[PDB]
Design a protein around this motif. Structure first.
Motif, PDB file in Angstrom:
ATOM      1  N   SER A 284       0.849  -1.188   0.000  1.00 51.70           N
ATOM      2  CA  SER A 284       0.000   0.000   0.000  1.00 51.70           C
ATOM      3  C   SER A 284       0.889   1.244   0.000  1.00 51.70           C
ATOM      4  O   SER A 284       1.971   1.239   0.566  1.00 51.70           O
ATOM      5  CB  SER A 284      -0.942  -0.003   1.211  1.00 51.70           C
ATOM      6  N   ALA A 285       0.436   2.298  -0.668  1.00 55.33           N
ATOM      7  CA  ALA A 285       1.195   3.556  -0.798  1.00 55.33           C
ATOM      8  C   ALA A 285       2.552   3.432  -1.515  1.00 55.33           C
ATOM      9  O   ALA A 285       3.456   4.241  -1.274  1.00 55.33           O
ATOM     10  CB  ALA A 285       1.356   4.237   0.564  1.00 55.33           C
ATOM     11  N   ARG A 434       9.525   0.543  -1.591  1.00 56.84           N
ATOM     12  CA  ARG A 434      10.286   1.772  -1.369  1.00 56.84           C
ATOM     13  C   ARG A 434      11.606   1.464  -0.657  1.00 56.84           C
ATOM     14  O   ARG A 434      11.617   1.171   0.549  1.00 56.84           O
ATOM     15  CB  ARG A 434       9.472   2.754  -0.511  1.00 56.84           C
ATOM     16  N   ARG A 435      12.709   1.545  -1.396  1.00 58.54           N
ATOM     17  CA  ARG A 435      14.044   1.363  -0.828  1.00 58.54           C
ATOM     18  C   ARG A 435      14.907   2.572  -1.190  1.00 58.54           C
ATOM     19  O   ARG A 435      15.331   2.694  -2.343  1.00 58.54           O
ATOM     20  CB  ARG A 435      14.685   0.065  -1.345  1.00 58.54           C
ATOM     21  N   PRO A 436      15.163   3.475  -0.218  1.00 54.01           N
ATOM     22  CA  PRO A 436      15.959   4.668  -0.551  1.00 54.01           C
ATOM     23  C   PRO A 436      17.397   4.374  -0.997  1.00 54.01           C
ATOM     24  O   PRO A 436      17.949   5.131  -1.806  1.00 54.01           O
ATOM     25  CB  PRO A 436      15.929   5.493   0.749  1.00 54.01           C
ATOM     26  N   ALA A 437      17.975   3.278  -0.497  1.00 50.85           N
ATOM     27  CA  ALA A 437      19.339   2.870  -0.831  1.00 50.85           C
ATOM     28  C   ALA A 437      19.439   1.398  -1.277  1.00 50.85           C
ATOM     29  O   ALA A 437      18.521   0.595  -1.047  1.00 50.85           O
ATOM     30  CB  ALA A 437      20.239   3.105   0.371  1.00 50.85           C
ATOM     31  N   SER A 460      10.067  -2.381   2.505  1.00 52.82           N
ATOM     32  CA  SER A 460       9.552  -1.093   2.049  1.00 52.82           C
ATOM     33  C   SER A 460       9.473  -0.060   3.184  1.00 52.82           C
ATOM     34  O   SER A 460       9.159  -0.412   4.315  1.00 52.82           O
ATOM     35  CB  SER A 460       8.173  -1.312   1.434  1.00 52.82           C
ATOM     36  N   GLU A 461       9.794   1.200   2.884  1.00 53.13           N
ATOM     37  CA  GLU A 461       9.551   2.330   3.813  1.00 53.13           C
ATOM     38  C   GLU A 461       8.077   2.470   4.215  1.00 53.13           C
ATOM     39  O   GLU A 461       7.190   2.246   3.394  1.00 53.13           O
ATOM     40  CB  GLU A 461       9.993   3.664   3.198  1.00 53.13           C
ATOM     41  N   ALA A 462       7.839   2.878   5.464  1.00 49.35           N
ATOM     42  CA  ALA A 462       6.475   3.063   6.003  1.00 49.35           C
ATOM     43  C   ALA A 462       5.781   4.321   5.460  1.00 49.35           C
ATOM     44  O   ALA A 462       6.428   5.329   5.172  1.00 49.35           O
ATOM     45  CB  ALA A 462       6.510   3.102   7.526  1.00 49.35           C
ATOM     46  N   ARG A 466       9.239  -4.970   6.764  1.00 48.45           N
ATOM     47  CA  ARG A 466       9.201  -6.231   6.007  1.00 48.45           C
ATOM     48  C   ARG A 466       7.790  -6.386   5.434  1.00 48.45           C
ATOM     49  O   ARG A 466       6.826  -6.252   6.179  1.00 48.45           O
ATOM     50  CB  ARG A 466       9.489  -7.428   6.928  1.00 48.45           C
ATOM     51  N   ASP A 467       7.657  -6.643   4.130  1.00 51.56           N
ATOM     52  CA  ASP A 467       6.333  -6.860   3.526  1.00 51.56           C
ATOM     53  C   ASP A 467       6.420  -7.880   2.402  1.00 51.56           C
ATOM     54  O   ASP A 467       6.251  -7.530   1.229  1.00 51.56           O
ATOM     55  CB  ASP A 467       5.712  -5.535   3.046  1.00 51.56           C
TER      56      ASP A 467
END
Ligand SMILES: Nc1nc2c(ncn2[C@@H]2O[C@H](COP(=O)(O)OP(=O)(O)OP(=O)(O)O)[C@@H](O)[C@H]2O)c(=O)[nH]1
Ligand SMILES: O=C(O)C(=O)CS(=O)(=O)O
Ligand SMILES: [Mn+2]
Ligand SMILES: [Mn+2]
Ligand SMILES: [Mn+2]
Ligand code: NA
Length: 611
Positions: A284-285, A434-437, A460-462, A466-467
């Motif tokens: 999600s998001a 979403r992984r910034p690095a 993924s970033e919140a 872990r997802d």
């Protein structure tokens, strides 16, 4: 048949008839009518008249407002306590905990929340008796999937929310034709109450009935029941979507040899007019809806949408992976949706669309963060909290999880096979978050087993959470058994296993700017995937899988995009990554972790060590 009246609620039926209902549907309605004590029973027919009258009633009651700028569009504003799916109040009931979640070593599972039959029964009895007093119980007969698809499943939702009835008409196929198609077949029993019997004990906020303190979204897969109390919002109340089509369905899927997944489905067509379908699971998001109805920047390419959120997939007798969108609409995030980020959404939501928790313009339109449509001077904005809002207020004008609810049939690029009863043939599966690095723009799995591991390893970033498979909130049963079920697809007769990819739109340089422009430009990534499915020699092998060769990605018209940083793979990063995956899988999955997933972890660790 009766000494007095029996449990005959015929007298309170204000539309349709209990005699018209199939026998088992009648019991479901009457048993819960007796329990919940509604004043009236309304059996939904799904017609335009019913829909129009319901919207006008909600309008009278102050529950929704008409958006007079658009053709038949509406705005609902909720109690700020009831704004999203709540995972912490979401449970699955089974005899054994281990059938619902693996037994975590550390003691707290991230893979679902189990509740005992005994504990649920107490929770149920503290909530539902008399809960619909003074309200109408709507009976919503609905099909997940095109009516009479061999892949479609039927449900019956009982609810005391007119908003849920309206939203379900958009998000499912609902009405008399569903009852006719159902006959004496099996169906998923869906019970929902907002949990505010009249007269109201507590005062109502924003004309939005809800009960945060008693909110509980329960699944009883062995009884084929979903029982939801206290929230009127989205995944908590539209029981066909997450509760049925992911949680209940994922369990059915495992038992019957198919897959129910948190995946968009899209058709992509190259300049030659050659067509493939791709499925993609992001949390999600994390941009499923943007991708599913992409406007591709690359000349000659065409993306068409089958679905943006749920995919039911099954290998047919030919061995093609057949996917249907079980939904009938899009329940998409509103903020971020501009002409640039998502033009095909902007065109779909012009008419017959319900908005929830977005801002309203003085001229009867909708507003939200990142809409990128400036307003005329003099046009003012009412926030989602029903208060005046300037651009220099500290708060946003729309809630961050505010949504539109729009018919899928209205999408300009809806795929001509989006309702084909046989489904569309999937040739590639994409994972991502979403992984910034650390994680390149795109890579390809080395095998089915590696690909299943790639799904399992998703983060993924919140705070990076872990997802696995974008299904962390939605597994209907033991995640380890889910992995076994995925891996089992490799031993099917004639199964043509799709190519598995992992993407990352959200990689950033050390100043925190996105290294990739994304959105429409992601057609450049889909081009590569298309070619790789075709067998093109566009891939270089790395420790994590195949990446595109130098100059294989079409970056024409992007200019100075940093391929170095964007495709960089660091030993130090990946050593840390595999260690964190190992510990997670050991803790969270343990004895239910399939051998093959352990093997892929050991293989990835080994390949990284050789860097
Ligand atoms: N940088 C970047 N951000 C993106 C891209 N696509 C989507 N997003 C971001 O993702 C968010 C929108 O995605 P959502 O529609 O919320 O995600 P979703 O997967 O549809 O979520 P659910 O409907 O809840 O399952 C916004 O913050 C966008 O900026 C992209 O290609 N690049
Ligand atoms: O959270 C999600 O993944 C959604 O699609 C929204 S809801 O259906 O869960 O409200
Ligand atoms: Mn009234
Ligand atoms: Mn979703
Ligand atoms: Mn979405
Ligand atoms: Na309201």
């Amino acid at each position: 048949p009766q000494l007095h009246n029996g449990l005959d609620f015929s007298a309170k039926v204000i539309q349709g008839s209990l005699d018209s209902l199939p026998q088992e549907v009648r019991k479901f309605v009457e048993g819960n009518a007796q329990l919940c004590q509604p004043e009236y029973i309304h059996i939904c027919d799904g017609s335009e008249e019913e829909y129009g009258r319901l919207l006008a009633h909600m309008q009278e009651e102050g529950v929704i407002r008409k958006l007079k700028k658009y053709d038949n569009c509406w705005l609902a504003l909720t109690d700020p306590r009831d704004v999203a799916r709540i995972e912490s109040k979401t449970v699955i009931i089974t005899q054994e905990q281990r059938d619902t979640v693996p037994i975590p070593k550390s003691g707290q599972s991230q893979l679902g929340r189990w509740m005992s039959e005994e504990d649920f029964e107490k929770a149920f009895n503290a909530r539902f008796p008399g809960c619909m007093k003074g309200r109408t119980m709507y009976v919503i007969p609905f099909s997940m999937g095109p009516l009479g698809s061999p892949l479609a499943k039927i449900g019956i939702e009982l609810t005391d929310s007119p908003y849920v009835v309206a939203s379900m008409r958009i998000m499912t196929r609902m009405g008399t034709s569903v009852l006719e198609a159902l006959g004496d077949g099996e169906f998923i029993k869906c019970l929902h109450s907002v949990g505010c019997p009249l007269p109201l004990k507590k005062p109502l906020v924003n004309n939005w009935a809800c009960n945060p303190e008693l909110t509980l979204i329960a699944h009883l897969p062995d009884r084929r029941e979903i029982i939801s109390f206290g929230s009127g919002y989205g995944g908590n109340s539209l029981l066909g979507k997450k509760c049925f089509a992911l949680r209940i369905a994922s369990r059915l899927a495992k038992e019957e040899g198919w897959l129910a997944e948190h995946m968009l489905i899209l058709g992509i067509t190259n300049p030659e007019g050659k067509k493939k379908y791709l499925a993609a699971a992001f949390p999600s998001a994390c941009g499923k809806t943007n991708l599913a109805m992409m406007n591709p920047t690359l000349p000659g390419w065409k993306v068409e949408c089958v679905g943006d959120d749920i995919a039911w997939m099954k290998f047919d007798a030919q061995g093609n992976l057949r996917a249907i969108n079980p939904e009938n609409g899009f329940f998409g995030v509103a903020p971020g949706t501009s002409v640039k980020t998502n033009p095909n959404a902007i065109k779909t939501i012009q008419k017959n669309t319900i908005f929830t928790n977005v801002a309203e313009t003085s001229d009867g339109g909708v507003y939200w963060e990142g809409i990128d449509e400036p307003l005329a001077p003099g046009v003012t904005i009412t926030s989602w909290k029903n208060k005046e809002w300037r651009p220099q207020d500290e708060e946003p004008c729309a809630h961050p999880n505010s949504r539109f609810c729009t018919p899928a049939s209205q999408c300009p690029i809806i795929d001509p096979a989006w309702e084909s009863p046989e489904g569309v043939p999937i040739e590639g599966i994409i994972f991502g978050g979403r992984r910034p690095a650390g994680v390149p723009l795109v890579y390809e799995a080395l095998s089915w087993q590696h690909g299943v591991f790639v799904g399992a390893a998703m983060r993924s970033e919140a705070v990076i959470m872990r997802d696995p498979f974008a299904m962390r909130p939605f597994f209907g049963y033991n995640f380890g058994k889910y992995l076994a079920h995925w891996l089992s697809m490799a031993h099917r007769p004639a199964a043509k296993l799709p190519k598995i990819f992992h993407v990352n739109w959200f990689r950033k340089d050390k100043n925190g700017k996105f290294l990739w422009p994304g959105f429409g430009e992601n057609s450049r990534v889909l081009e590569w995937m298309f070619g790789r499915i075709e067998g093109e020699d566009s891939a270089k092998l790395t420790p994590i899988g195949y990446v595109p060769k130098e100059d294989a990605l079409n970056l024409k018209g992007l200019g100075d995009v940093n391929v170095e940083e964007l495709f960089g793979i660091s030993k130090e990063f990946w050593e840390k990554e595999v260690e964190e995956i190992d510990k997670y899988l050991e803790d969270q999955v343990n004895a239910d972790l399939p051998y093959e997933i352990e093997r892929e972890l050991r293989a990835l660790k080994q390949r990284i060590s050789q860097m």
